[PDB]
Amino acid sequence: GAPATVTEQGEDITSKKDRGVLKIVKRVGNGEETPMIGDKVYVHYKGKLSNGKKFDSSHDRNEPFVFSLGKGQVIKAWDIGVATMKKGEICHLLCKPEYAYGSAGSLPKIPSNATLFFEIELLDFKGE
Ligand SMILES: COc1ccc(OCCN2CC[C@H]3CCC[C@@H](C2=O)N3S(=O)(=O)c2ccc3[nH]c(=O)sc3c2)cc1OC
Protein backbone atom coordinates (compact mmCIF):
# COMPACT_ATOMS: atom_id res chain seq x y z
CA GLY A 1 0.00 0.00 0.00
CA ALA A 2 0.95 3.64 0.06
CA PRO A 3 3.01 3.47 3.30
CA ALA A 4 5.09 0.60 1.93
CA THR A 5 5.54 2.45 -1.35
CA VAL A 6 6.87 5.64 0.26
CA THR A 7 9.09 3.54 2.54
CA GLU A 8 10.63 1.73 -0.43
CA GLN A 9 10.41 4.36 -3.19
CA GLY A 10 10.43 7.72 -1.40
CA GLU A 11 13.05 10.42 -1.59
CA ASP A 12 15.06 11.43 1.45
CA ILE A 13 14.39 15.15 2.01
CA THR A 14 16.42 15.54 5.19
CA SER A 15 19.46 17.82 5.31
CA LYS A 16 21.34 15.09 7.20
CA LYS A 17 20.44 12.46 4.57
CA ASP A 18 19.59 10.03 7.33
CA ARG A 19 16.39 8.83 5.59
CA GLY A 20 14.32 10.13 8.53
CA VAL A 21 11.77 11.79 6.24
CA LEU A 22 10.88 10.25 2.89
CA LYS A 23 8.58 11.90 0.36
CA ILE A 24 6.62 11.09 -2.81
CA VAL A 25 4.84 13.85 -4.70
CA LYS A 26 1.37 12.48 -5.55
CA ARG A 27 -0.15 15.57 -7.17
CA VAL A 28 2.05 18.21 -8.67
CA GLY A 29 1.18 21.68 -7.45
CA ASN A 30 1.38 25.14 -8.97
CA GLY A 31 4.46 26.98 -10.19
CA GLU A 32 7.80 26.80 -8.45
CA GLU A 33 7.32 28.70 -5.20
CA THR A 34 7.38 26.94 -1.83
CA PRO A 35 6.41 28.63 1.44
CA MET A 36 8.90 30.59 3.47
CA ILE A 37 9.77 30.38 7.11
CA GLY A 38 7.12 32.01 9.21
CA ASP A 39 4.38 31.78 6.60
CA LYS A 40 0.91 30.78 7.68
CA VAL A 41 0.32 27.47 5.92
CA TYR A 42 -3.05 25.77 5.45
CA VAL A 43 -3.06 22.02 4.93
CA HIS A 44 -5.35 19.04 4.80
CA TYR A 45 -3.91 15.80 6.02
CA LYS A 46 -4.46 12.29 7.21
CA GLY A 47 -2.10 10.26 9.36
CA LYS A 48 -1.67 6.52 9.83
CA LEU A 49 0.38 4.42 12.20
CA SER A 50 2.53 1.52 11.05
CA ASN A 51 -0.16 -0.86 12.37
CA GLY A 52 -2.54 0.57 9.74
CA LYS A 53 -4.67 2.65 12.14
CA LYS A 54 -5.74 6.12 11.02
CA PHE A 55 -4.91 8.39 13.95
CA ASP A 56 -5.98 11.79 12.60
CA SER A 57 -7.59 13.57 9.67
CA SER A 58 -8.38 17.22 9.06
CA HIS A 59 -10.83 16.24 6.32
CA ASP A 60 -12.99 14.57 8.93
CA ARG A 61 -13.11 17.91 10.83
CA ASN A 62 -14.18 19.93 7.76
CA GLU A 63 -11.45 22.51 8.38
CA PRO A 64 -7.79 22.76 7.47
CA PHE A 65 -4.90 22.59 9.88
CA VAL A 66 -3.08 25.91 10.11
CA PHE A 67 0.41 26.59 11.46
CA SER A 68 3.39 28.89 11.00
CA LEU A 69 6.11 27.13 9.03
CA GLY A 70 9.56 26.47 10.42
CA LYS A 71 8.78 27.41 14.00
CA GLY A 72 8.52 23.96 15.67
CA GLN A 73 4.74 24.22 15.97
CA VAL A 74 4.58 20.79 14.39
CA ILE A 75 6.79 17.70 14.30
CA LYS A 76 10.11 18.11 12.54
CA ALA A 77 9.04 16.00 9.57
CA TRP A 78 6.21 18.45 8.85
CA ASP A 79 8.38 21.57 9.07
CA ILE A 80 10.83 19.89 6.68
CA GLY A 81 8.23 18.32 4.40
CA VAL A 82 5.75 21.15 4.04
CA ALA A 83 8.66 23.50 3.26
CA THR A 84 9.26 21.44 0.09
CA MET A 85 5.66 21.68 -1.19
CA LYS A 86 4.10 23.90 -3.83
CA LYS A 87 0.58 25.31 -3.53
CA GLY A 88 -1.91 22.62 -4.55
CA GLU A 89 0.60 19.79 -4.10
CA ILE A 90 -0.35 16.52 -2.45
CA CYS A 91 2.47 14.40 -1.05
CA HIS A 92 3.09 11.35 1.05
CA LEU A 93 5.58 11.58 3.93
CA LEU A 94 7.10 8.70 5.85
CA CYS A 95 8.43 10.00 9.18
CA LYS A 96 10.79 8.08 11.44
CA PRO A 97 10.28 8.75 15.16
CA GLU A 98 13.31 11.04 15.42
CA TYR A 99 11.40 13.45 13.15
CA ALA A 100 8.06 12.82 14.88
CA TYR A 101 7.22 11.95 18.52
CA GLY A 102 10.35 9.98 19.40
CA SER A 103 10.41 7.71 22.40
CA ALA A 104 7.73 9.74 24.16
CA GLY A 105 4.93 9.16 21.69
CA SER A 106 1.79 11.24 22.01
CA LEU A 107 -1.16 9.99 24.06
CA PRO A 108 -3.66 8.64 23.39
CA LYS A 109 -2.96 7.61 19.80
CA ILE A 110 0.78 7.52 18.99
CA PRO A 111 2.99 4.93 20.65
CA SER A 112 6.64 5.20 21.56
CA ASN A 113 9.11 4.90 18.68
CA ALA A 114 6.40 5.26 16.02
CA THR A 115 7.06 5.65 12.30
CA LEU A 116 4.22 7.73 10.87
CA PHE A 117 2.65 8.02 7.40
CA PHE A 118 0.96 11.20 6.24
CA GLU A 119 -0.88 12.34 3.17
CA ILE A 120 -0.66 16.15 3.06
CA GLU A 121 -2.25 18.68 0.71
CA LEU A 122 -0.82 22.22 0.79
CA LEU A 123 -3.90 24.40 0.31
CA ASP A 124 -2.35 27.83 0.65
CA PHE A 125 0.45 29.78 2.25
CA LYS A 126 0.71 33.45 3.09
CA GLY A 127 3.09 35.80 4.84
CA GLU A 128 1.62 37.70 7.79
C1 LIG B 1 8.52 21.00 17.61
O1 LIG B 1 8.22 19.70 18.14
C2 LIG B 1 6.88 19.44 18.19
C3 LIG B 1 5.88 20.36 17.90
C4 LIG B 1 4.53 19.99 17.97
C5 LIG B 1 4.19 18.69 18.35
O2 LIG B 1 2.89 18.26 18.44
C6 LIG B 1 1.85 19.20 18.35
C7 LIG B 1 1.62 19.49 16.86
N1 LIG B 1 1.01 18.37 16.08
C8 LIG B 1 -0.36 17.95 16.36
C9 LIG B 1 -1.24 18.32 15.17
C10 LIG B 1 -1.09 17.19 14.12
C11 LIG B 1 -0.93 17.77 12.71
C12 LIG B 1 0.45 18.38 12.57
C13 LIG B 1 1.51 17.31 12.79
C14 LIG B 1 1.40 16.80 14.21
C15 LIG B 1 1.78 17.83 15.11
O3 LIG B 1 2.92 18.27 15.01
N2 LIG B 1 0.04 16.31 14.55
S1 LIG B 1 -0.23 14.65 14.24
O4 LIG B 1 -1.08 14.47 13.00
O5 LIG B 1 1.09 13.94 14.20
C16 LIG B 1 -1.19 14.04 15.57
C17 LIG B 1 -2.55 14.07 15.43
C18 LIG B 1 -3.38 13.62 16.44
C19 LIG B 1 -2.87 13.14 17.57
N3 LIG B 1 -3.55 12.65 18.63
C20 LIG B 1 -2.74 12.24 19.60
O6 LIG B 1 -3.11 11.76 20.67
S2 LIG B 1 -1.26 12.45 19.19
C21 LIG B 1 -1.53 13.10 17.71
C22 LIG B 1 -0.69 13.53 16.76
C23 LIG B 1 5.20 17.79 18.64
C24 LIG B 1 6.53 18.15 18.56
O7 LIG B 1 7.56 17.30 18.84
C25 LIG B 1 7.09 16.03 19.27
Side-chain angles (χ1 to χ4, degrees), residues 1-52 54-127:
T5 295
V6 61
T7 299
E8 296 174 347
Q9 309 296 332
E11 187 174 286
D12 186 356
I13 61 165
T14 65
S15 63
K16 287 186 185 176
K17 296 290 172 49
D18 63 11
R19 292 180 61 83
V21 186
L22 304 177
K23 181 184 179 195
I24 294 173
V25 176
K26 297 292 292 181
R27 182 178 73 200
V28 171
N30 304 326
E32 303 178 28
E33 193 176 11
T34 61
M36 73 167 286
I37 182 170
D39 281 352
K40 191 172 183 195
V41 297
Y42 296 75
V43 303
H44 267 308
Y45 72 99
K46 67 167 193 183
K48 296 185 148 182
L49 299 182
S50 56
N51 67 9
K54 169 162 83 181
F55 65 85
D56 200 5
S57 166
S58 60
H59 299 278
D60 293 342
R61 288 191 289 270
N62 303 121
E63 61 176 51
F65 181 79
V66 183
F67 69 103
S68 302
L69 186 66
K71 299 294 164 183
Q73 294 183 357
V74 291
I75 58 171
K76 289 173 182 163
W78 272 48
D79 270 340
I80 298 163
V82 175
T84 71
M85 297 181 73
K86 285 83 168 184
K87 185 172 168 187
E89 181 177 317
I90 302 174
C91 79
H92 290 176
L93 291 182
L94 196 281
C95 309
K96 301 307 288 178
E98 295 79 10
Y99 292 86
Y101 295 93
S103 46
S106 185
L107 267 66
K109 308 184 173 169
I110 299 176
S112 185
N113 301 328
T115 293
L116 306 180
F117 170 85
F118 293 94
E119 183 165 84
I120 302 174
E121 179 179 0
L122 180 55
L123 302 164
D124 203 6
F125 59 91
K126 67 190 180 182

